[PDB]
Amino acid sequence: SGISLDNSYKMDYPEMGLCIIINNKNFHKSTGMTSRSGTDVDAANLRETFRNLKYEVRNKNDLTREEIVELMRDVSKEDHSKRSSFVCVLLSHGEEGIIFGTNGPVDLKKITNFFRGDRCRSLTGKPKLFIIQACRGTELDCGIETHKIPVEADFLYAYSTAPGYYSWRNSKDGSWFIQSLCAMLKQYADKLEFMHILTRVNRKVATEFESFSFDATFHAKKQIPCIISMLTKELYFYHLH
């Protein structure tokens, strides 16, 4: 056959892959972590959005740290040979490097290690996407007026916010980042490479949202999401028939 290029991940396997959504709304009282009003709106929006991208969506609600680890271990041990990609969405409290189960923290490194190129062989060479709506610290952005492959290769972290910063969630509309991510996937998943979709998400969050608070400390604050790419190819959710 004619000249061939391989600048993009093969996304025409029989299945697009799993979309695991971990939706942590209610936390154990002893942790002192507040309920995350609005996160169900996020979880429902993600379920529909990735359903239309033909992902096999699994929604899990209010998981302990132990349940999060066991779920991700179990998922990593499935046979993904017929799947193009893997997506995990984490909706919870967090700090830098950490996502919270309902009763305590989980290292993000422990979650993502289960999917290393050497530990999940049926996902080696395939994009592994981790989409994280959670705080990364307590900073606030005041804004300004205007033969082998590496085991860490082929991961993408779509973080809702910059390192060190809070992330914003609206109790009625859902989180700024997940709202914007789903809108941009709905509009551009049949049109744009994934990094370009995520860049539109960056602009939408950065330009269309500002916090409103009776507390001057938390009022009029802004947010920029953070794309972390170890991908080795372009990622398009569509393929050519």
Binding site: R36, G94, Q133, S160, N170, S171, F218
Partner: peptide, 4 residues
Amino acid sequence: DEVD
């Protein structure tokens, strides 16, 4: 608006 709330923070996570």
